[model samples]
Target: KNQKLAEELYKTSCQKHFTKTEVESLIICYKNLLEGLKMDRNLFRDILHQKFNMTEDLLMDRVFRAFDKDSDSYISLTEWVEGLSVFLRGTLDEKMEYTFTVFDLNGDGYISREEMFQMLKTCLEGIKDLVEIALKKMDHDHDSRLSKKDFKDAVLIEPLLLEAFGKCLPDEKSSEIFEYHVLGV
Candidate 1:
C-alpha cells in the first residue's frame, strides 16, 4: 500500500534486464499485487488453454526448452536473457551471458539469491502480509521448487494455447505478446 508496489513495478521494469533472484523476487511481488487486485491470475497461463487447445504441461515444456540454453535441463541465467531479449539470434551462450549481466544485482560477477530478494524487500510498504503469498505462488512448475526451469516451463507452456493455439503462432508476435502479458504491463 506504499512504495512497495511502486518499487516492485520499477524492479520489474529492470527485471527485463536482470536475472538474479532479486529480479525474480520483484516479479513475484508484482504478481502478488495483481492477485490482490483480483486481476486475472494466469491470463498468460490461460491463453493457450483458451485459444490454441494446448495442454498446460506441453506448453510449459516448450517454454522450458526455448530458454534452456545449455540443454542442462535447467534455465541458467543465460537462457533467461535470450528468452527475454530483442537480439534473439546470437550464439546461445552469448545470449545467456547477457542474462548474467542483466541480473547481476550488486554489479557483482554473479547474481545471488539474496540480492534478488532484497529488491522487493526494499519495496514493500504496508503489504507485509502479501509477501509470503507471493513467494509461495512463483512455482511455475508446481513441483514445489522454484527455478528458471520452472519459470521457463510455465512461460513456454503459457502461450502454446494462444498464438501457437491451433497452430497459429508464426513467430515473434506470439512470443512478444507472451512476454508483455508475463510482465503484466
Candidate 2:
C-alpha cells in the first residue's frame, strides 16, 4: 500500500521537499489540475489568478516558469509538484531564493539592468526608467545591480510594496484552504 505511494511521490521533483503525506496531498492537487491527464498553462493560470486571486500576470508568469521546468509549455505531474513546493509551501527565505533566481536571468548571482530590461521588455513601463528605479530601490552599494542579499533584504523591509518583484507565495489562510480544497488534505 505505502510502497505504491512512495513510488508516486518519487516521480515528482518535490520528493526532496515534501513529506510522504504532503506528496500524497500534492498528487491529489496535481490530479485536480488535469484534463485528460495533462495540465495546460492557460487552465493553470485561471486557477491561480482567478480562483486563487494570485493576480499579476507578470508575477504569475514567472511562477509558471518555476513549475514548467522543462519549458515544455505545459505542466507534467512532476513539474506541478515541484513548482508547488515553492508556490504553496515555501518559507520567506525559500521564496526570496526562488525570486532572486528568477530575476537573475543569466544566473550569475546579480540582477543586472540588461536582465531586468528583458524581464520587463513587454511591460508598458519604460524599460530604462523602471530599471533605474529598481536598481536605486535595492542597490545598497549603488552598484547599479542587485545581489540576492540586497534584493531579499529590501523586500523583507517592505513586503507588500514589492508585489511585482515576486511576492507570489500564498498567505497562511490561502495556503490552508488551497491544500484542503485542491488536495482534500
Candidate 3:
C-alpha cells in the first residue's frame, strides 16, 4: 500500500534480481491475487494451472509448497516475489534447488524411490519402469534415492532433466508473458 514500504521490501527481499519498479508492480499484482492478504494453496494452484500451463495436481501442490517458503500454507508477499524471481529468471543453480524442492515431495533431503514414482506417475502414466530408469541415470550413488547433489550433477550434464519428473518451472514464453502482464516490462 505504502510506496516507501514497497521500496523497502524490494531492498530486503531477494527480488533485487528484479528492478525496484518491477518488484513494486509485482507486489501490487500479488496483493490483488490474494484471497485476503495472503495466497492460499488453491489460489496458488489456480495461478500455476491457469497462467503457467501446469496441469498436474500433485506437482502443482508441490510447486505451491515451493513458493510458500515458510510452510505456512499461504504465500506471503515476500514469498511471492522471491519465488517468482526463481520461477521467472532463476540461474541454473537456483532452478536446481527449486526443482529439487518440488521433486522431494515429503520434504526429505532425498527424493526416495517412492517419491520419484509418485511424481513421475502424474506426468506419465509404467512410471515404475520410468522411475527405475530415472534412478539408474540420476542416482549416481546407487542408493535408490536422488540427493540434491545427485540431481544437480545429473541435470548439469543434461539440462532437460531439470524438470524430468514434471513441469514446475515456467517455460520461457510463459515467463515473458507473465512478466509483461504483471510487471509491464
lDDT of 2 by residue, 118-176 (tens): 66553225567867877776756887788889888877766643555544556667777
Candidate 1 versus truth, CA RMSD in Å, comes to 18.4
On residues 149-174, what C-alpha lDDT tens digit does candidate 3 reach at each position? 88888866665455565367887788
Candidate 2 vs candidate 3: which has greater lDDT?
3
> What Cα-based lDDT does every candidate model obtain?
0.39, 0.69, 0.80
Mind sharing the TM-score for model 1?
A: 0.25
lDDT of 1 by residue, 52-97 (tens): 3435453334444444545666543333433444222334333334
Instruction: State which candidate has the highest lDDT.
Output: 3
| Model 3 CA deviation exceeding 4 Å by range | 124-126
C-alpha RMSD of each candidate structure in angstroms:
18.4, 4.3, 2.0
- Highest TM-score: give the candidate number: 3
Candidate 3 clashes: the total is: 0
Q: What is the lDDT of candidate 1?
A: 0.39
Order the candidates by lDDT, highest first — what do you get? Answer: 3, 2, 1
Error of 1 at 31 (Å): 5.7
Error of 3 at 45 (Å): 1.6
- The CA lDDT at 174 in model 2 is 74
- Candidates 1 and 3: which is better by TM-score? 3
